[PDB]
Amino acid sequence: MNIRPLHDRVIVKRKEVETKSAGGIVLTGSAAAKSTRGEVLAVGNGRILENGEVKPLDVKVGDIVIFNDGYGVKSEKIDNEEVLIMSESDILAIVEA
Amino acid sequence: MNIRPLHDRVIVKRKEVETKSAGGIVLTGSAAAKSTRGEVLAVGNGRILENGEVKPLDVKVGDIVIFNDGYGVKSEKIDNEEVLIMSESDILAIVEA
Amino acid sequence: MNIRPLHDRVIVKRKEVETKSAGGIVLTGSAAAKSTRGEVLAVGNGRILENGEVKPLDVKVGDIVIFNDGYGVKSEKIDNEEVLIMSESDILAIVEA
Amino acid sequence: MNIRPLHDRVIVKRKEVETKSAGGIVLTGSAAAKSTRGEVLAVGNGRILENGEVKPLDVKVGDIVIFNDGYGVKSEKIDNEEVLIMSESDILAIVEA
Amino acid sequence: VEDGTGLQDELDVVEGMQFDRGYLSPYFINKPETGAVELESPFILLADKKISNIREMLPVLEAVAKAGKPLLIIAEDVEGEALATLVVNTMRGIVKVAAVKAPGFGDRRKAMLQDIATLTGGTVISEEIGMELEKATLEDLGQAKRVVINKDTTTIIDGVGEEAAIQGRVAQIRQ
Amino acid sequence: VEDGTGLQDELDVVEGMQFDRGYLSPYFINKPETGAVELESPFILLADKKISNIREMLPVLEAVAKAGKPLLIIAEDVEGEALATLV
Structure with a gap:
């Protein structure tokens, strides 16, 4: 909640x-690599744009993710877990190929 | 009023x-932590965008909140209580998970 | 007129x-406090946006007000009275709670 | 013409x-006061926005005016008379109260 | 005592409160042969701070123009914003005014201005002592008989101030 | 011992805690003939830091105004923001 x-x-x-196994091999020091990959924990259900019936969101909760880090992405520690809040449109892929 | x-x-x-109990444990000094969480005290009732019948606002008064602090958010001390005035769209969650 | x-x-x-009675008690020096509160003296009657019949303005003349001070707000001394001219949309509340 | x-x-x-009689009384020096008030000398007849039949302009020629000085307002000395050319929308009032 | 080039000694006694400051504008002179501005029955503003906004001070000024007694402005820093506007009013006979720079500098000038206020039955009118300057009423100013101002000289004849208040300030100064 | 211009020696004993600092505003004086501010029964604020926000300090100040005992402010750096408001 x-x-x-x-x-x-x-x-x-x-x-x-x-x-941390860079190339599968070397144990990297400070790459400082924040993965652009993610895992969907929740979805906004609908988009009400254009004064029309709530357009369904593009996919669904419980798939992993690939997102564009941006001003729209917001870092919130909901409960004890760091989570990121953004529009569904700020995502750049799931899994396509 | x-x-x-x-x-x-x-x-x-x-x-x-x-x-003030950081991690549930330590008594924090100056975190200066302004919670992005909130509690809804009032709602604007409707959105008249797109020259259409007042679209109902997304949720309703008397739930807690999670908002994006922004220029749109405005600090007003209505009566003796500090309250924040923004568009309903400036909110980033209630409770989703 | x-x-x-x-x-x-x-x-x-x-x-x-x-x-000038801050907290109801102390007589404040230079707060320099320009109240974001106001009183409606006139209304623009309608909005012609979206090529549609003049949408009625949200409320009406002769209520007090709460407005966002902004570039859109314009200071004009109509007659001998300082008055502020803005779009109806630059307002942030009347009285909601 | x-x-x-x-x-x-x-x-x-x-x-x-x-x-030049400030307050009705004092004879002001350099106020440098360019009145935001004006007098309508001509009107653009219609607005063709939204691919619709020419919306009539909000009012009509031969009333005085109150305008927002802006980049859109353009100073042109048509003939020997200084006149200002702007969109009808750059105006902030005529006479309302 | 001062050097006097006349070979005979001469004594001059100044009467009343005189501060060594002069008219800001030569245009202020209302008596050209004298070369001095004589205001008969003046009100006196003893102002705080730097004031180059006639822009803000106006409603006080309007009230004086209606009243029709001349006015003196004592103040710290003054543009042509005031002086040309004052020339526009004075030299074309709408209002009757003159203006001088406040004496010396610093808190010593402030301590001195209070002495003038007590003498003139007037007030040190000041933001930093709690008045918006533009809120002042005609009774909030001082008054006196008659003033004369040169390019070096300011003289003030006989104040409205309460005699026991003046004697009190003289005694408070004596402490 | 200090130089005293009076040709006879005089001894002065200060009583209690005295620090050599003076009123920030001449307007504060409540006893003009004395030339000094006498506060009978004061509360005392011993403050940290530089404080030119009456703006923030207000609810404490309101409580004192209701209480009606005089107050002394000891502090490091103070604008007219406080002093004119105090006057």
């Missing part, structure tokens, strides 16, 4: 910080 | 300033 | 400058 | 420069 997910928004974990 | 809530706006308290 | 109110605009007095 | 008024534009004189 937070309070409601917001309309047209998504809540994700960031997938990892440092996949 | 103020004077009317504005159309498409919301009035919230900020939920807290400093949840 | 000015010359017509403009379309979609409002004319307000600013409610006060310095409510 | 100029050449046509432009579509959605208005032509106004500025009402005065310095109403």
